[PDB]
Scaffold this active site. Structure first.
Site, PDB file in Angstrom:
ATOM      1  N   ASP A   1      14.406   6.786  -7.486  1.00 18.14           N
ATOM      2  CA  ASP A   1      13.419   6.153  -6.415  1.00 18.14           C
ATOM      3  C   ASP A   1      14.656   4.882  -6.125  1.00 18.14           C
ATOM      4  O   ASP A   1      13.699   3.608  -5.394  1.00 18.14           O
ATOM      5  CB  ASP A   1      12.280   6.513  -6.307  1.00 18.14           C
ATOM      6  CG  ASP A   1      11.146   6.192  -4.836  1.00 18.14           C
ATOM      7  OD1 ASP A   1      11.913   5.891  -4.220  1.00 18.14           O
ATOM      8  OD2 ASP A   1      10.312   5.967  -4.832  1.00 18.14           O
TER       9      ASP A   1
ATOM     10  N   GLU B   1      -3.345   1.064  -3.357  1.00 21.79           N
ATOM     11  CA  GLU B   1      -2.763  -0.154  -2.985  1.00 21.79           C
ATOM     12  C   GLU B   1      -2.497  -0.836  -4.248  1.00 21.79           C
ATOM     13  O   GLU B   1      -2.657  -0.504  -5.607  1.00 21.79           O
ATOM     14  CB  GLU B   1      -3.657  -0.891  -1.414  1.00 21.79           C
ATOM     15  CG  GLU B   1      -4.253  -0.471  -0.997  1.00 21.79           C
ATOM     16  CD  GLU B   1      -5.611  -1.080  -0.063  1.00 21.79           C
ATOM     17  OE1 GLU B   1      -6.241  -1.398  -0.821  1.00 21.79           O
ATOM     18  OE2 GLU B   1      -5.700  -0.128   1.154  1.00 21.79           O
TER      19      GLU B   1
ATOM     20  N   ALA C   1       0.507  -0.845  -0.628  1.00 19.00           N
ATOM     21  CA  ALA C   1      -0.347   0.050   0.174  1.00 19.00           C
ATOM     22  C   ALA C   1       1.033   1.458   0.001  1.00 19.00           C
ATOM     23  O   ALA C   1       1.910   1.197   0.355  1.00 19.00           O
ATOM     24  CB  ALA C   1      -0.829  -0.068   0.888  1.00 19.00           C
TER      25      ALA C   1
ATOM     26  N   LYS D   1      -2.031  -2.306  -9.438  1.00 18.11           N
ATOM     27  CA  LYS D   1      -1.791  -1.282  -8.260  1.00 18.11           C
ATOM     28  C   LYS D   1      -3.030  -0.223  -8.277  1.00 18.11           C
ATOM     29  O   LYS D   1      -4.136   0.492  -9.842  1.00 18.11           O
ATOM     30  CB  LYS D   1      -0.768  -0.105  -9.315  1.00 18.11           C
ATOM     31  CG  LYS D   1      -0.745   1.141  -8.135  1.00 18.11           C
ATOM     32  CD  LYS D   1       0.565   2.020  -7.432  1.00 18.11           C
ATOM     33  CE  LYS D   1       1.492   1.841  -9.400  1.00 18.11           C
ATOM     34  NZ  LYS D   1       2.538   2.800  -8.490  1.00 18.11           N
TER      35      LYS D   1
END
Length: 266
Positions: free
Chosen positions: A129, A23, A18, A38
């Protein structure tokens, strides 16, 4: 639109993860194929903002990267992708199965992640990321880069984030924290930190240090203390990713090539 599938071909089974924006559930597409689905938390992001992540995935396909399968553009919106049975590398390394991995398999996986990052590099994109939590592991213990929500195509030399944007200090390059500027060399720094997460089986970078202490020590020229049980060769490869001047950091294909050499040698 051609990536569209009727909502009825999907049957969700259980929540995988999540986030702030929704989520990710495990499910089956047309009954026989396992997929990750997703979903967007209505209100969190705009539909476009959400689907932007899938349109980027349509342009970036590779074995080492989590593959887009389908989308459901009607509320609630879905981004359907390839399923990775063993979850996040950060969590898996802590399981009974992951605690067992030898340094030879840890080096193999690091090289696999660099190979994924090498393709992202050649295509002129950045991930922004990169960390163990965003590396997924398959049932055959191969790794794939996931979560392209921060990924961006780089046409003009760099990418500058908006003024209020906040980022994971222990994982983000100094230039990105200080001026919001990201390039593939910023991801290279993140990769070095990611390597510490691999060798320690999922431990938090800079053990015992707070965020402000990390920033201070980095400004003095210190870098992360040698992780426990980390081969000196890998640590020195880690240091190359932590060079002050971004352009002094290596390319990902060089990182991958050295890691494969550490793998063959172990």
């Amino acid at each position: 639109d051609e990536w569209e599938v009727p909502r009825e071909t999907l049957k969700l089974v259980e929540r995988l993860g999540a986030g702030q924006f929704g989520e990710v559930w495990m499910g089956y597409y047309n009954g026989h194929t396992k997929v990750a689905v997703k979903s967007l938390k209505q209100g969190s992001m705009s539909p476009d903002a959400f689907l932007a992540e899938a349109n980027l995935m349509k342009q970036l396909q590779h074995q080492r990267l989590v593959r887009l399968y389908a989308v459901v553009t009607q509320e609630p919106i879905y981004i359907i992708t390839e399923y990775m049975e063993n979850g996040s590398l950060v969590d898996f390394l802590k399981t009974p199965s992951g605690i067992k991995l030898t340094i030879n398999k840890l080096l193999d996986m690091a090289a696999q992640i660099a190979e994924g990052m090498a393709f992202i590099e050649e295509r002129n994109y950045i991930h922004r990321d990169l960390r163990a939590a965003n590396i997924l592991v398959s049932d055959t213990l191969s790794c794939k880069i996931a979560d392209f929500g921060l990924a961006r195509l780089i046409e003009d030399n760099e990418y500058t984030a908006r003024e209020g944007a906040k980022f994971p200090i222990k994982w983000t390059a100094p230039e990105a924290i200080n001026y919001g500027t990201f390039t593939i060399k910023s991801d290279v720094w993140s990769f070095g930190i990611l390597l510490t997460e691999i060798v320690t089986h999922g431990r938090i970078p800079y053990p015992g240090m707070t965020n402000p202490e990390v920033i201070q020590n980095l400004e003095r020229g210190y870098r992360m203390v040698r992780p426990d049980n980390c081969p000196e060769e890998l640590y020195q490869l880690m240091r190359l990713c932590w060079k002050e001047r971004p352009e002094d950091r290596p390319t990902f294909d060089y990182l991958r090539s050295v890691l494969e050499d550490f793998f063959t040698a172990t």
